[model samples]
Target: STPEKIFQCFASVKKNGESFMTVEDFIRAILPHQFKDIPYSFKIADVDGDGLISFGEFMFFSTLLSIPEASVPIAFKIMDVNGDGSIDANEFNSILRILSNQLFGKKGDKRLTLDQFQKFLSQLRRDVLQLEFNFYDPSGRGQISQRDFGLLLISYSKQLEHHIKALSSLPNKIDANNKGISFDQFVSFNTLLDKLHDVELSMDLYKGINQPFTKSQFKYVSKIICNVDPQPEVVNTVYQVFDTDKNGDLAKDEFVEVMYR
Candidate 1:
């Protein structure tokens, strides 16, 4: 993979002569996953770092119009999280378009090892995921309500809304309400997307053995493969949305097609 581009996704941005780091921006500008509070060295990363460097240009274009009150730096981090919880991913790209992100070495040339880069990838993925789960489940509940789950689905698209509404109405439908969707379910959904190939393979393997990809089987796959576990209702809703057959099994081709779709 091209080294420069991947960094923008979860790595640092190296442009012109400056390398703008992103981890800090996520901390200083956005809600940062609290790390070990270090003493001297980290303060440099914390203090000097703006996270988005010339990310000012991004704010100039994308945000300045909305925030004309005060130019205090405190306001950016404060207000950034308070109301803008629904920000889409495209803006990160747009911000990337504006300029590369920030650096830790006060003014030194910051070089990264492949291991560090690899660590960052996994770390950032989980960091963002945890934060996003919290965003949807903003109340005291560690799990999200059905409406919150539906909003997330609908946020993805109305196609989900079409299916979800249909499922809530039918005879085959089982409503396991009051009990909300936990982080594990949310994680399983995300992990399923990432492991779609393996998920497809598992389903096909079941089909070859003349066995149905039942809810229990999927739960097995969730634990053994993805290390994530969604509840029965979660799996049932997913099955109804994609496979749509009440015959009691997720369709391999249908699941993959709908997943990739």
Candidate 2:
């Protein structure tokens, strides 16, 4: 299976090292799910579109999941697709799919299906919503808005200065917006991408706990930014809501429920 093969790859990564000890040690040390989505996460972190994740590169990357930022080992075993202390691209993509569905799809039978593609497209229907697709527009002028455009270009100009500043330079090239880009048009349409990223990463952090992340740690990383921390009382309420059938641990099926409500 693709999932099993992916895990084999990750197990290899975990074991071929003098610093981290054996694959079993790595798997046992982190949360079980950490292994589940790591393939996808690793792909994202590769950043240079390179085929291989280098030792210096990957070692720095691993810091995000280590102690303090997360509990030691941080329950990465969840990412272990094959339960063999490793992962691969397929297993990693699977984790992204799992997370996207939980973050955006309806709760209960929230499985991703062919129909979901149509549903995702349907979300772009302007006629149904009586509003232009402003995700590509920052001005909300029934056309392309600048605020929505600059978010993509500014980062590169400031850092690399490679002259990729035009909003049309966005990887999507979604230029259906009737108006051209302008200043003061930075629209934030990352609700979907940001939500998915933060939820999965934050959820990984959450799973690091024997109980919960230490107060200082929890304060830094959470599912929502600038939100109140989940206190024991709030946790009691949320845990009950997530438990559904009253099971203490949240099952995969119940994941979306907690995500939305």
Candidate 3:
């Protein structure tokens, strides 16, 4: 029932002892009591839902839950029942049951409460932010410059490059005098990077002012959003909820608002 045990379940379910876990793994790990509406949970884990979950996506989710990078492996091992090196449905469920009891002090409360899950996610995000900031600032200088940050992306693809360019203002936005980005500034900039990427994706969905959001556009953006949010219903819900005027037209700001959160 410990966080450590739950983390191990995530690790065990990963493909080939890798960092990424499947949508199935994520759902079971987080919401074991309910298996029917698993896709909704998948949307949160997939982040841009092309079916396969990547390490980055998992890292993002883990950070949201406040899980530290160093202890990830240890947690993974705990979930690897039978020493088989991977997690299965039964194993995952069993571990989750234990966790449910640990968290609630009884087995009757099988599902993870919304408030408890939110708190875990918030702490995870904070821990991950500090972990990454420290990684980029190995010398513990307490600050990072643009040069020191090095774009913070793993790919050189055109899309990623554009994303990097869009976030170039991070340095200036953080430090007016260009002194450097403190840890606090680093967190702000990093959070904004996600928002900017979401904005860029939304802009891509913009066919024209009059067109608004079309089904095709939604499908296209869903692929991108799936990386951070993969639930179809959730996306649809956001679109419908934010259509504001209910004219079926989604303003750029509206889409931004949906993903920014």
Candidate 4:
């Protein structure tokens, strides 16, 4: 339901009769009100790192931003630029340039100002944190007892269960008297969750193709920050050990298996 509402918002701004929104239309749909440079915003939506925003990517981002759920088919129709259904990098970039010009009125200055960008992001975080806080502070008390916060941590997923358990200790650390967590404490804990989620997302990115990573892929990932001394042998060794199914490539789940091990 939330996703459907997000899609409707995207569809509402679709170019007339166009299958896909030009970069301008895409930009407008995503940020009709507002850049930390168009590139940064573009980077966020191009989740697959393939330089294009498909419906899947768009949906992922829209949901991430917590776009209003209520919104149009006409706009949606235009986003499928090929009409075969699916947006591409070409359409994404084209509209971006135009949207940039519209915002800056400089013919090429696409992207929202850093302030606007930050505002958008801050509000999203606020909404999410407030929602979570409300679950434990249902009486609108503006605070949560340590026990209540612990209750919030109860999760079915073991990974989350561990994270929650760790986080549950926060009240003791921050509120030594165990008087109850203030809004600031509540937000601080959620911020840690955000960082943890990002780490999980990065792992997901590495396993995106649903196949084992080749030497090149492994190299690309491993060499991202620093150049480890001649690790070809090391790389192969890792490949052999982690290639659990022995399919010659790494699936995400398999990589995760190794990670958790």
> How high is the CA lDDT of each candidate model?
0.50, 0.34, 0.48, 0.47
lDDT of 4 by residue, 46-66 (tens): 644655455555665564465
TM-score of each: 0.52, 0.19, 0.33, 0.32
lDDT of 2 by residue, 81-200 (tens): 467544344443453444323312233233333243234223322121221133244345543333333333232111223223332333233255433432222212222223434544
Off by over 4 Å in 3: 1-112, 151-177, 196-198, 201-261
lDDT string, candidate 1, 58-86, tens digits:
23322322222223233334433434432
- Per lDDT, the best of the predicted structures is 1
RMSD of candidate 3 to true structure, Å: 16.5
Candidates 3 and 4, the one with greater TM-score: 3
**Between 1 and 2, whose lDDT is larger?**
1
| Model 1 / residue 30 / CA error / Å | 13
Candidate 1 worst ten-residue window by lDDT: 33-42
TM-score-based ranking, best first?
1, 3, 4, 2
lDDT value, candidate 1, whole model:
0.50
| lDDT at 63, model 1 | 35
Runs with alpha carbons beyond 4 Å of true place in candidate 1 = 1-103, 107-110, 150-162, 167-178, 228-230
